[PDB]
Each structure stands twice: as structure tokens, then as C-alpha cells.
């Protein structure tokens, strides 16, 4: 009954924006967790980048990969919406400066370099497996991937698998404490998600996020929340196959967000 808000507003925007909607919600601090529609599948989109980089930093403590070698961008290697590899055609970057740049801003370009880096999406499905996560798959690179296609098992993952990898990514020990704060603050200095959950973010509160949007509507956010008297709180929001508006998307997110924050602030 904790969260009977939280359903009833999620309940309202599925009927709404005639919307598949799925929401996960897991307390560190006691063990609880709950969910809506938490088993159902949704596009990755860019939340999947978090992966990705992640499994950069897990092959380069393993010493499979120098995270601190340089790729050589080619212009025939862009891809749609790539501000930070754009203006370095002809150059190289390292693959930890490509993973802040896709964990930043969400820079496809860098996305891929960082993809072909760690075994495509074939080697960041096994990584998944291998951390416990049975549902998450990732199988293309940019743009193909955000598709979104009702049915598709392709670049999908419940709200409750990610939220749970999520979840061990940070807390867990797979990463060294060094590469879970890396990791951790490439969450929190991302630029891209202003007008998402920070922008209902509790006073004093601190946030780590990752969003994604794509094909027929796939609107989602990834993100871990917490403050001196709160210990973190996962947070998954997935929206698919609506005809809705960006606005009205992003709308869901604040207010199904909001709910969620009023469990723990009241």
C-alpha cells in the first residue's frame, strides 16, 4: 500500500497515452522492492549505454582492454546525433573519454567505438548472463538498435532486470570501488536528462541517471537516487509503442518520478 500512489499515477498514464508502461523500484536500505507490469519487455534504447561502459571498466581491471587506448575516428564511423565525436573526425580518443562522452550526452558515435571495444552486443550479452541478469540482451549497434518494435526480443530488458543489474553494478563488487565511483559519476554528470527525474528531485537529494528514447514511443530512464538520511533507491521507468509527445512522455516520467520520491520523502 507503500506505493498505491505510485500504481494509481502509473495506472492513469497507461490509459492516457494508451501506452505498455513498466516501472521498478528497489530500496537498498531494507531490502523492498515493487513493480508494475516489472516483468514485461521493453526497448533499451540508451539506457543501455550504462552496460556498455561498465563492461569497459570490468574488461580493463581484467586487463582484456586498455581503457586508456585511442580509437581513430573516421567520418564514415558517424552516426545520427554524435556532438562530441562529430567535431573529432580525423583524430583519436580514448575509450574512457568515449565512454564520457556517450554516458554524458548519449553520443551514439561514441557508443559504437565503445561496443566494438568490449565485444559488441554479443560480448555485452554475455557479460549480462554472467552478472545474473537472464532478461537484458543487447544485439545491435547505433542507430538499429532503438527500432523498438512491438514483439521484437531484440536490445530489450525489464524494468526489473536492468534495475537489478543497475543495482549490483554500483553496490555489488564485480567493479573495484574505483570503477563503481567512475561509473557512478559518469551517472551523475550526465547533461542530457534535466527535464527528467532532476527536475522533481528532492532538495538535498543526489541522483546517478541514464535515459533513453526511441522508435514508437520507447521513452525510459535508469537511475539511483540517495542522501544522508537515504540510503539508494533504483528506479527504472520504461514507456513503449505510444503515439504520445516527447513532452507528454517526459511528463509521465516527472510525475510517475514524483510519486515515487513522496514514498520516501513523506
Known sequence: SKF?????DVKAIEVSLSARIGVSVLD????????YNGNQRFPLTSTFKTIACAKL???????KVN???????????????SPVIEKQVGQAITLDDACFATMTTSDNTAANIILSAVGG??????????????????????PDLNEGKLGDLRDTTTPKAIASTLNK???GSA??????????????????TGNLLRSVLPAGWNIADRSGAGGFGARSITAVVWSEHQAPIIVSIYLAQTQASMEERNDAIVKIGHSIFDVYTS
Not at 57 to 63: H, I, K, P, T, W
Request: hydrophobic content about 30%.
Open 57 to 63: 571498466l570490468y574488461d580493463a581491471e581484467q586487463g
Open 121 to 142: 552486443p554479443k560480448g555485452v550479452t554475455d557479460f549480462l548472463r554472467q552478472i545474473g541478469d537472464k532478461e537484458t540482451r543487447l544485439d545491435r549497434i547505433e
Open 175 to 192: 567493479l573495484s570501488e574505483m570503477n563503481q565511483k567512475k561509473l557512478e559519476s559518469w551517472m551523475v554528470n550526465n547533461q542530457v
Open 67 to 81: 581503457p586508456n587506448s585511442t580509437v581513430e575516428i573516421k567520418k564514415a564511423d558517424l552516426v545520427t546525433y
Open 169 to 171: 553494478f554500483l553496490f
Open 28 to 35: 537498498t536500505q531494507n531490502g523492498e522492492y515493487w513493480d
Open 4 to 8: 498505491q500512489q505510485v500504481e494509481q
